[PDB]
Amino acid sequence: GFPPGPPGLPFIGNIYSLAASSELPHVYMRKQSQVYGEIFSLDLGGISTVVLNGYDVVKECLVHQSEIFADRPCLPLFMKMTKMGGLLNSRYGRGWVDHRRLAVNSFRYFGYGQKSFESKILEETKFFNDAIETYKGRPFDFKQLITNAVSNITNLIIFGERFTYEDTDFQHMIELFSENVELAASASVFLYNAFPWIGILPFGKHQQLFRNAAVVYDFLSRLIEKASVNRKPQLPQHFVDAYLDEMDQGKNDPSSTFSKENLIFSVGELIIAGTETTTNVLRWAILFMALYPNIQGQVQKEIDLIMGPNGKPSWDDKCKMPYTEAVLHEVLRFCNIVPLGIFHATSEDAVVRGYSIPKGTTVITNLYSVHFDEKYWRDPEVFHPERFLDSSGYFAKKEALVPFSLGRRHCLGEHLARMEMFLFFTALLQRFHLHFPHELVPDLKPRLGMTLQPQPYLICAERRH
Ligand SMILES: OC[C@H]1O[C@@H]2O[C@H]3[C@H](O)[C@@H](O)[C@@H](O[C@H]4[C@H](O)[C@@H](O)[C@@H](O[C@H]5[C@H](O)[C@@H](O)[C@@H](O[C@H]6[C@H](O)[C@@H](O)[C@@H](O[C@H]7[C@H](O)[C@@H](O)[C@@H](O[C@H]8[C@H](O)[C@@H](O)[C@@H](O[C@H]1[C@H](O)[C@H]2O)O[C@@H]8CO)O[C@@H]7CO)O[C@@H]6CO)O[C@@H]5CO)O[C@@H]4CO)O[C@@H]3CO
Ligand code: HEM
Ligand SMILES: C=C1/C(=C\C=C2/CCC[C@]3(C)[C@@H]([C@H](C)/C=C/[C@H](C)C(C)C)CC[C@@H]23)C[C@@H](O)C[C@@H]1O
Numbered sequence: 001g002f003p004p005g006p007p008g009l010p011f012i013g014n015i016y017s018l019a020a021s022s023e024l025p026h027v028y029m030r031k032q033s034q035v036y037g038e039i040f041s042l043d044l045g046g047i048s049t050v051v052l053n054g055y056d057v058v059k060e061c062l063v064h065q066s067e068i069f070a071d072r073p074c075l076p077l078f079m080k081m082t083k084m085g086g087l088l089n090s091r092y093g094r095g096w097v098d099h100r101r102l103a104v105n106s107f108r109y110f111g112y113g114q115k116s117f118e119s120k121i122l123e124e125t126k127f128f129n130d131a132i133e134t135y136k137g138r139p140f141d142f143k144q145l146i147t148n149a150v151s152n153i154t155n156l157i158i159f160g161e162r163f164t165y166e167d168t169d170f171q172h173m174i175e176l177f178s179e180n181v182e183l184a185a186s187a188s189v190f191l192y193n194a195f196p197w198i199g200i201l202p203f204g205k206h207q208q209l210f211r212n213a214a215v216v217y218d219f220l221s222r223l224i225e226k227a228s229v230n231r232k233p234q235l236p237q238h239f240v241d242a243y244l245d246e247m248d249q250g251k252n253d254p255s256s257t258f259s260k261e262n263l264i265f266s267v268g269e270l271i272i273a274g275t276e277t278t279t280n281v282l283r284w285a286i287l288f289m290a291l292y293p294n295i296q297g298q299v300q301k302e303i304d305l306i307m308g309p310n311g312k313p314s315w316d317d318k319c320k321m322p323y324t325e326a327v328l329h330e331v332l333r334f335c336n337i338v339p340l341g342i343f344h345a346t347s348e349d350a351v352v353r354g355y356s357i358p359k360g361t362t363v364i365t366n367l368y369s370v371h372f373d374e375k376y377w378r379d380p381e382v383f384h385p386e387r388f389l390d391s392s393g394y395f396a397k398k399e400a401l402v403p404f405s406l407g408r409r410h411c412l413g414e415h416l417a418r419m420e421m422f423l424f425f426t427a428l429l430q431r432f433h434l435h436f437p438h439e440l441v442p443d444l445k446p447r448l449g450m451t452l453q454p455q456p457y458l459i460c461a462e463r464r465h
Pocket of ligand 3: 078081082086088089180181184212213214216217220264265266267268269272273276277338341342450451
């Protein structure tokens with residue numbers, strides 16, 4: 001019948017287990033799969049949940065049974081925030097198809113599908129690097145500038161413009177939205193979802209999340225208004241105009257799923273999905289380059305060979321730069337920015353590997369455990385870019401690397417993110433040498449959150465040529 005799993009206390013189930021563990025949840029779950037198998041279950045305060053561990057079981061569900069596992073779970077928090085509409089936490093259905101299709105098309109059309117786009121990224125690297133230079137090699141935290149820079153790339157697509165690094169109102173909105181992605185992972189919210197009557201309690205991380213969500217919702221709708229002011233119907237300049245075009249064409253269809261609400265939800269989802277994740281990839285990579293300068297320098301050696309010490313980075317250089325691509329893939333594999341993906345749910349009663357999974361069960365894809373699957377990786381616990389190089393020195397793509405997930409819900413911003421990653425990384429490492437202050441001992445244990453990010457750390461960036 002249902003998959004087995006560790007026991008915990010009545011009422012709260014394995015919320016106790018996760019909470020009581022020294023380990024972060026994805027690590028905890030991986031360890032439990034060594035006892036209970038690749039597919040096991042957790043009881044999260046009475047919400048029944050199955051966890052998928054290792055590459056084979058994750059592929060078997062999200063790919064072989066893609067429609068069955070394409071859904072999102074109706075956790076109280078998700079219902080409150082977005083009523084299971086929008087895009088990211090939309091239920092699998094027509095609503096999702098509509099918003100997904102529009103986003104995919106918008107990102108090609110207003111983004112990388114256009115000849116001029118790559119240089120808009122490069123402009124952002126100049127703004128970014130220039131900002132870094134202003135510190136004149138003195139130690140500082142990159143978090144804010146990186147966030148500014150990365151978020152601007154999607155701002156171009158969604159709003160048709162970048163915002164300046166003085167726009168603290170926008171920055172403040174992103175700051176609250178990040179807290180929410182972090183708080184989504186807390187015991188407090190796992191309990192809230194189990195016992196939603198906890199909403200009566202005025203104190204705690206759940207009230208912080210709802211308060212934040214309110215402030216974020218208002219701001220985003222105000223931006224969306226400002227973005228639609230000069231709109232020329234059926235000639236859109238960005239995703240917002242495109243969305244409004246859609247609402248116009250579905251005016252007489254009552255079952256049309258586009259709405260002012262769903263526009264705010266899907267815009268917010270697109271903004272935070274891009275900013276949280278890519279920012280953190282770069283923050284992890286910078287951390288590791290400062291920690292392992294022989295790797296940093298080998299990357300820089302390739303930049304100098306292929307880009308020259310002075311030439312403008314190009315996406316087209318990627319395939320002349322396998323060691324650089326290797327480092328970046330190894331950051332993704334090792335640091336696991338989205339360790340447990342986004343939770344799925346079964347759109348119907350499912351049977352997988354003999355076990356039954358009733359419709360609506362939360363299904364956690366432990367992407368961490370895929371990246372550490374010893375069937376497919378040698379010494380996964382070791383940071384070693386070289387694992388991605390083949391015997392001729394070229395980058396070798398591995399099927400068991402899935403940091404953007406698989407199946408119907410796979411990251412929709414994958415291609416854009418890879419361009420940003422590559423171009424920001426090379427632009428930065430071409431212009432600066434990075435190292436820690438007083439060579440201070442930095443912390444590599446990630447913070448608990450729906451994404452993994454490093455603790456605050458200072459860096460010195462010193463010009464090179
Ligand atoms: O005031 C009497 C109060 O009695 C009952 O509440 C008890 C509660 O059930 C217990 O859990 C415990 O509370 C402790 C709590 O568990 C700790 O977490 C803590 O608080 C920290 C929080 O963790 C942290 O989040 C933050 O708190 C901030 C809030 O998150 C934030 O939302 C805001 O709070 C303000 C609210 O916006 C607003 O509701 C208003 O509060 C009034 C309530 O509306 C009203 O119901 C009543 O509260 C009763 C309650 O009904 C019982 O269940 O009066 C409140 C006015 O005093 O104003 C809030 C205050 O600004 O801002 C806070 C900023 O702190 O930080 C704290 C740091 O400690 O400590 C608690 C220790 O008591 O006990 C309480 C009763 O003591
Ligand atoms: C390093 C960069 C990124 C990483 C590691 C990452 C990671 C992920 C992961 C793990 C998922 C889970 C999919 C699932 O199993 O349901 C996902 C989906 C998603 N991502 Fe990303 N992401 C990145 C960049 C982006 C960017 C740049 C955007 C938007 C600009 C974005 C927007 C989304 C959205 C909207 C979904 C949900 C898609 C759906 O529900 O169909 N992500 N991403
Ligand atoms: C969609 C929106 C809202 C909330 C969005 C949230 C709040 C809870 C946590 C969510 C659902 C995140 C979940 C946990 C997914 C996070 C993945 C890992 C991302 C960061 C890659 C994404 C949007 C977050 C309501 C409101 O604030 C407007 C905003 O547009």
